[PDB]
Amino acid sequence: KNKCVNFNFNGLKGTGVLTESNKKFLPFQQFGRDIADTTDAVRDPQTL
């Protein structure tokens, strides 16, 4: 965490800094998108 890294989340490619988030995803909710229709939040597949 806390560094610009390449990540593969459930087959989803990405590149960015992973930081702790204050969003409370619903139990079913998996991916988060911002106003500009881009992936901004993710839920770790192992630790909720």
């Binding site: 106003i35 500009a36 881009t38």
Partner: peptide, 23 residues
Amino acid sequence: NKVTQKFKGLTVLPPLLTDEMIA
């Protein structure tokens, strides 16, 4: 008072003259 950002490439350059100088 009466008049009322993701950057995947777009940016908003600040104006050269601030509001104080215009005032």
